[PDB]
Amino acid sequence: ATVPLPAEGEIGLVHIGALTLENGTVLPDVTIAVQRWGELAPDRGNVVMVLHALTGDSHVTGPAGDGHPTAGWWDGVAGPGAPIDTDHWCAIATNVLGGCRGSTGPGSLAPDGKPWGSRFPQITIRDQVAADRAALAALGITEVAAVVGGSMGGARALEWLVTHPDDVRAGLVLAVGARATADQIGTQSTQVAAIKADPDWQGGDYHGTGRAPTEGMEIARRFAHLTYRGEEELDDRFANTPQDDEDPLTGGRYAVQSYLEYQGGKLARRFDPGTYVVLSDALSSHDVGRGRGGVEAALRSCPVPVVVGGITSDRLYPIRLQQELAELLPGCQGLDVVDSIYGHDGFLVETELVGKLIRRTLELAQRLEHHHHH
Amino acid sequence: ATVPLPAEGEIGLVHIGALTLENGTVLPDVTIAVQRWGELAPDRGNVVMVLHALTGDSHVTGPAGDGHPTAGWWDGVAGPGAPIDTDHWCAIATNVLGGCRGSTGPGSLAPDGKPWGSRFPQITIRDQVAADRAALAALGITEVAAVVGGSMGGARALEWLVTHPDDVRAGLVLAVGARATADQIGTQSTQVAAIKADPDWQGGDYHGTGRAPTEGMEIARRFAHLTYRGEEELDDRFANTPQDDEDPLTGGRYAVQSYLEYQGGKLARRFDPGTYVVLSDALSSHDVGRGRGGVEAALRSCPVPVVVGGITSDRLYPIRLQQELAELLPGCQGLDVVDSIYGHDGFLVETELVGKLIRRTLELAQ
Fold it and tell me: Within 13 Å and on the Cβ side, how many CA atoms surround B55?
């Protein structure tokens, strides 16, 4: 029968069984990790699906501890009277398919008892939607009030809206495009190449060997982190200043260099290289128009009310992409600009501005749910 | 007598002896590779110094031939009636100090008979200007009519102008800033880290071992190439299209990915990883304000007539940097805006527009 939600804030492991993927590969025995905040309404009409980005997980909000290395990636967003007001909403977040924080990914054990590793299938954003839909269906949830996400989570949100418009009332699509761009695929494929160059990659079958391509993932993450920054803010913050008392003229580090090294290290302590590869390839696959007559036709026939957010200084998902989403989606009233110096990472750091987009999306979803009968 | 200029199109190797570098290290027995086009005037007053960028060399112009597997990196810029009209001007280009195409760099032999490798000193843009000036002096040339360069070549030109305003009549500073930015240092230092991560780096001492960190340099060059592109143009050219008949949904390549792999490979066939490291660190060192009371003081101090060019779509040296240079250099009449979709690589691709800015610069030199 249907499986119960985990206790508030705790990890629930939802076993959804075999999943047929977009490329025709069957992935057996999938598990999706779930966290939720807020009660499920008796009519199951109050679900807000919170969709994490590349290195995110199900830990949207709350402090570090009890298996979580840091505070939630959107800490503060869900709570009483918060942008996701848990007095009304049931905020659910999964660990994405391919992930390394409780869901089936390359580190997970294949039927042969060895990690998937190099055997892990190519997945798409659509596969990530399909796995989350199945996890919800196993929890007895067939309709969602809203999908919300930034970055890779915006790609997930947008595919969810386009693929299942009859089963979502509204969405927030923040800091993403309709499809991966040449520059996104370029950086993503080159980050992947930096991981695969690392001799400890062992063809993707390093899991359980005691060696891992952390060094190559640290290089990938340093390049990705630059794509996430606002150029002007980064120069205002570090300029060409040396790190502490080091002397770059005789081989010491610059402050921005030391910072990037620290970012690489932080990721290597919490995140799996193989997951980085799989999710980076799923981002390169992003294309809402595939099999749907292209991006313009796919977005123009999607009727879902949508808040489209774009960040002025974003270098990875530049604001022209969100202007295109806002023009093509008929349920978008106009682009909501996030006026920020913090680049793409504004989707995480501009808590007040992002929280206002979320609250607008959910006020809209509540009005539509009052008129939606199921 | 002076060291003779090489015959038009041939490489001359100019031995300048020891160089005291900015960090105090003395680099012994330096050789600078030189090429020139056009006659040196009887008064030695008609030299136009052409300053190459990160992966350039002395081969400014001319076809692929013996000793040059590809066309000049600024092919057509110098020649009869060309933007550097060699009927009137003597175009000279070095291989930069730290380079791998004839000049002393990491691959060159140290006094101890082994490649410099990990013993190669950290050099600055100012050290590159000092090496070029010493090579010109050995050839009997103590002043130049103009310095021209884009990118790292722009940093070399700017330091030349600010350091030696009495010894240059005009300059072109194209697609660079007054100092390295946090983003430039971030990508430069991470590109270097990709090379050093490669187990064939061998601490910098791979030269002559039969192994080289080409894989790490190919990674570094793929990321650098993206910094050189205009985002919109790159998406217009490749979008998310697959490479030929490959299927990215089952592990195939995208067209942009295949193109980047190709760019990496091309550099691996012609360029030394150790040179990449040394010159990337020289770029991170770039700061015309150092020891001069900061960038604004240093630029305001320089009275030389200067054409400052910036590319509207440049993602690596964004145009705010060239607006700063244009505002502060008193010899600059305004920012020359190169309205181009081709990003930073515009400094190489926009030959007609770059040629126009070179003609303006040589008008100021007269």
Answer: 21
